[PDB]
Design a binder for this molecule. Structure first.
Ligand SMILES: CCCCCCCCCCCCCCCC(=O)O
Ligand SMILES: CCCCCCCCCCCCCCCC(=O)O
Lengths: 59, 59, 255, 268, 57, 268, 57, 255
């Protein structure tokens, strides 16, 4: 959860030089990103998730 | 953009300048809207604490 | 010596050659193998051709346009009407097999795009209306590629499957589909994708007709783009080869 | 035990760990050491909490029902099935194939209903819980011979002491509790479709053994499931879209994630 | 016939357990099985790919 | 074990133990033997009671709250924090850094509220206590899905038997429970100031499982903290000035000590 | 697997303790740790100062 | 195994990856090393962070047009206003360090051109007028790339540097600049150029502010060309990393 005492940081990506293309090729491309954990990840204090909710017992 | 396949794409085009920004987000895996629905985020939202490194793979 | 981008695969009397291919993904680390004697439950003798049943069947091709949402295939249903694999799974009661999936989409150096090939095991799909469940004619298409939809399906009463793409029909984030064995075909480098799925099921053998284990899904995350002057018809082909197929319970033809 | 990082020093070599090929379908395991100098930090942290057994081994309330000492509903009937409570169903849906034993605790709480009958003398209520496997007889009425339970398992509980609790083994004709079933019941391909095909776990009834008093008393029973010795196979992506029905996975399409201001905003 | 095992304590004490019921499905939940094998989901490729190598030579 | 004095006899030497230098910051340890003749008395006394573990290991009531079976307040909410009770807070403030496990006992007592409703039939009240870690869902209402507790820890208790009790390990992202924090949350130096920065221990809710009767019943719950395996660092001077707020150390200036008649009076 | 220890009695008898819970944070409070070291707070100076000596020669 | 065109460089907390790079040139055969005890002259203890001081600082980028004559940089001055290297060389009196130079200019297969990257040690430059000498504001530009000139600078009295390109400002044939460690970035093959210059000076340590040893020079021998349809804005980036940096003579801030 959010807490200023344990702020994380900021991840920013910047153009280094440019994106140059030859003739008859598109000049607008896309980039995709995947996130994963390293060999040293750990978690603790199991709690309920704030995403799933039910108004009544589904039936 | 969250209601289509355009949410996972980061646009990059041939610019007339250099040094501009492409994207940026805070390191909040269990809170920020960017990492909330990732597998890592879905797992983290069940546990109060977390520690370790992170690996961002760009394609 | 040699390079890793070149691969050749032989099965039965069929061969597949690729010159720009990535590393093969082998399921969950298990190569498909026959049913051992310490695991079987049917006391009858099984039949194992392993030549006619195991070979590369080439399905129908679909066109990749700039506004294509994706396609899904059911591995037991797609091959049900093609060759002796179809004839055998039709004359028997219990069947068991693993599958090799090859997807072929080739483009020049001036095209761009990216596809996700994922083998989802047990892909139950939600109906458009909460009360009804999808029908057998809408969920699985025999030797046909059922396309997805860019916008949500209508909630009016019907037996149509929810074909919205950003939920994959199973009600999940399309982003988290990676957990399953998957390959990326980027027209910048890869031209083909190979997957080897073993037999993943909760029983030793199951009837193929009333249970489709694996559902191949192809999703174009990054759309296809080009400039005027390049060929606009870029197709996608899918070849499926059964492996270590065996059957039990010989019964009168049933369709 | 969590692994520890290894110390590294400035390098200048042709081989580059950071650059790889994500089209292969392989997760590039890169230690922080590859992309920057690091010092030797021992990690004494443990992954003990994460284990599947510790994640799923917590009591969760599947369903609760009500019955009255005197009135139209004198007994309660419930088909024993999961997918009625979102909190547990979501946790179980993480794995396609699951195999676990179960511990059941029944929290039975009574209350007095408003009435006009005078001279009430409340007496210790006794509650009987009965489980009928698929095929057995059904108590069409609160008073019926079926409640003899010559073979079915049952538990009797007087109000005032610790709640009942029992342990149940792995009851399945297959080798694992399937959570997803992409098929029909009939080989005709027309008929019940989905996971409701593999739900034949029986029924659970409950009743008041003795009428407590003259004034009406309503009792509510809650059922708790505790998985033990759990094994999971084929991991699956998390739900995302809220559940609608308890017999299938029908849903309403929802956005991938919550939105923000722009592509360079650091705040939600 | 008692079983003596170690307790889960901090880093940087034995406890006793006896089984009373004869069904083998009534034992306490086995919580200490800290074993893993991430090779099935991550790096599942057929041909080994060393870290610092051109993944596609 | 307490040390014992050693016997000494009349001396006449240049070296003098009594005369020292207190400017050095050193406590001159002088046995009674140095300033007068003493006999050899063995001491069998022990310092067992003083040890930090025996001083802090006594149950103390941090906070108590009330909830009603029927009425506007049907559930109770409390942010789990110390510094609400002077007796324990003063004891803990003795050491700047503390590190202890905890034992929690909940004394729940019900009482009948005055009303006009007739024909009351009281039934065994059941009380559910739930702990939500920082980040989890909150039961906006007494009846809500959150009370399923699929992952959160909870305890159910029927009235009439021994009180509930649980043990809690050392929950802190740091290496010790800090008691004093001279800093802000923002690096800007503007924002929450003081110890309230490091208080993110969660919240504790409690409710009635079943409505007891028709007549209104009020229940009050008291929470007791019992430190176990305690370690203390950096000793600090005792409070002196009475506490005012539970989020900081704001106080009203008070005299050093109570006064007397003169400088040679032997009586208060 | 029992632990036998001594009881705290007067001056001038063994008791038994068994751990049942497997979390290591449920053990009884360890009350017998009569160890001290007053050198940190009293006499904390860098240079040793003998008792019967001119503290400032 | 692997190829020689791929290189990765790590320093401090920074990393540089190149996929089409030539062989690194290591000065005059000497890798930068700390000052030995049989060579020092300052009797004070030196300070050596080696993490904050040594890392890849990225400077400002300049545009490569069809009519660009070239650019020059002073290594001590350029990093004087960037990070702790600037703060340290500002709070001390004597400094010593070697430098790693990386130049990045990428173009597609349809562009053409060629650049010369040369590290000239002790590059004294002649003034436009024989009587005057160049001023400090015209010779060195802090975190700025001073461009050259295609035609001769006016001989009217001024403190302007002679920026004519075919004489490099130092009064030599631009052709004989090769004698110094140099790299060629041809857009046909190379995309980057790496140089490793050791500490070249006539004294053990010297003040950085009043003496700039090395002067990086980039000269486009063969101009850039393309046909209409290609991107016209092709930038050039320069990243400088200090190595084995140490200092002596702690004094009150001086600027
Ligand atoms: C007094 C009654 C005692 C026995 C009650 C038994 C009720 C539970 C039966 C087993 C159910 C196991 C879970 C099946 C659902 C699933 O796996 O998803
Ligand atoms: C049924 C609920 C059981 C769990 C309740 C846990 C509540 C206490 C959580 C730990 C608090 C430890 C003390 C923190 C405050 C301090 O150190 O000053």
């Amino acid at each position: 959860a959010s807490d200023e005492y344990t702020a994380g940081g900021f991840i920013t990506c910047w153009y280094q030089t440019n994106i140059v293309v030859p003739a008859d090729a598109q000049s607008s491309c896309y980039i995709m990103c995947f996130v994963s954990a390293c060999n040293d990840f750990s978690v603790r204090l199991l709690k309920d998730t704030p995403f799933i909710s039910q108004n009544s017992f589904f039936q | 953009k969250v209601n289509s396949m355009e949410a996972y794409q980061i646009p990059v085009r041939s610019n007339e300048g250099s040094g501009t920004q492409v994207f940026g987000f805070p390191l909040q895996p269990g809170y920020s809207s960017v990492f909330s629905r990732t597998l890592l985020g879905e797992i983290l939202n069940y546990y109060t604490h977390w520690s370790g490194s992170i690996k961002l793979t760009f394609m | 010596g040699y390079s890793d981008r070149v691969r050749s695969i032989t099965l039965g009397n069929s061969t597949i050659t690729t010159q720009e291919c990535a590393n093969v993904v082998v399921g969950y680390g298990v190569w498909p193998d026959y049913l051992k004697d310490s695991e079987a439950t049917a006391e009858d003798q099984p039949t194992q051709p392993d030549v006619a049943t195991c070979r590369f069947y080439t399905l129908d091709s679909v066109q990749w346009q700039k506004t294509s949402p994706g396609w899904w295939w059911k591995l037991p249903d797609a091959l049900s009407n093609l060759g002796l694999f179809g004839q055998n799974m039709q004359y028997h009661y219990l069947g068991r097999t693993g599958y090799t999936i090859h997807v072929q989409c080739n483009a020049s150096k001036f095209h761009q795009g990216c596809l996700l090939v994922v083998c989802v095991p047990e892909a139950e799909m939600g109906c458009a209306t909460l009360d009804n469940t999808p029908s057998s004619a809408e969920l699985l298409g025999g030797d046909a590629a059922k396309e997805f939809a860019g916008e949500p399906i209508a909630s009016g009463s019907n037996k149509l499957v929810q074909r919205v793409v950003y939920n994959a029909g199973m009600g999940i984030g399309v982003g988290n589909l990676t957990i399953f064995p998957h390959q990326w075909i980027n027209l910048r480098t890869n031209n083909s994708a190979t997957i080897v799925m073993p037999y993943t099921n909760s029983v030793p053998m199951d009837n193929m007709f009333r249970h489709n284990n694996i559902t191949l899904m192809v999703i174009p995350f990054v759309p296809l783009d080009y400039c005027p002057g390049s060929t606009t018809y870029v197709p996608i082909t899918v070849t499926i080869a059964p492996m270590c197929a065996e059957y039990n319970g010989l019964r009168l033809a049933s369709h | 035990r969590v692994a520890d990082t290894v110390g590294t020093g400035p390098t200048n070599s042709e081989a580059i760990p950071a650059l790889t090929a994500a089209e292969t379908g392989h997760t590039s395991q890169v230690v922080p050491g590859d992309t920057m100098q690091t010092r030797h930090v021992k990690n004494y942290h443990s992954r003990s909490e994460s284990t599947v057994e510790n994640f799923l081994c917590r009591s969760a309330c599947v369903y609760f029902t009500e019955y009255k000492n005197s009135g139209s509903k004198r007994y309660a009937e419930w088909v024993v099935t999961t997918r009625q409570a979102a909190q547990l169903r979501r946790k179980l849906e993480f794995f396609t194939y699951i195999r676990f034993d179960l511990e059941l605790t029944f929290v039975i709480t009574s209350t007095q209903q408003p009435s006009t009958t005078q001279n009430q003398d409340a007496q210790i209520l006794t509650h009987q819980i009965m489980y009928v496997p698929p095929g057995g007889p059904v108590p069409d009425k609160v008073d019926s011979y079926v409640w003899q339970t010559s073979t079915n398992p049952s538990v009797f509980w007087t109000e005032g002491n610790a709640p009942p609790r029992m342990s149940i083994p792995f009851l399945s004709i297959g080798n694992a509790y399937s959570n997803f079933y992409d098929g029909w019941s009939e080989f005709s391909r027309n008929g019940v479709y989905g996971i409701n095909t593999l739900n034949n776990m029986g029924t659970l009834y409950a009743r008041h053994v003795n009428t407590g008093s003259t004034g009406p008393i309503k009792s509510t029973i809650r059922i708790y499931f505790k998985p033990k010795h759990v094994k999971a196979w084929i991991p699956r992506p998390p739900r995302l879209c809220q559940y609608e029905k308890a017999k299938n996975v029908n849903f309403q399409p929802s956005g991938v994630t919550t939105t923000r201001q722009s592509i360079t905003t650091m705040t939600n | 016939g008692a079983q003596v095992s170690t307790q889960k304590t901090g880093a940087h004490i034995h406890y006793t357990n006896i089984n009373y019921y004869k069904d083998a499905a009534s034992n306490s939940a086995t919580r200490q099985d800290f074993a893993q094998d991430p090779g099935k989901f991550t790096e599942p490729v057929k041909d080994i790919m060393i870290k610092s190598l051109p993944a596609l030579n």
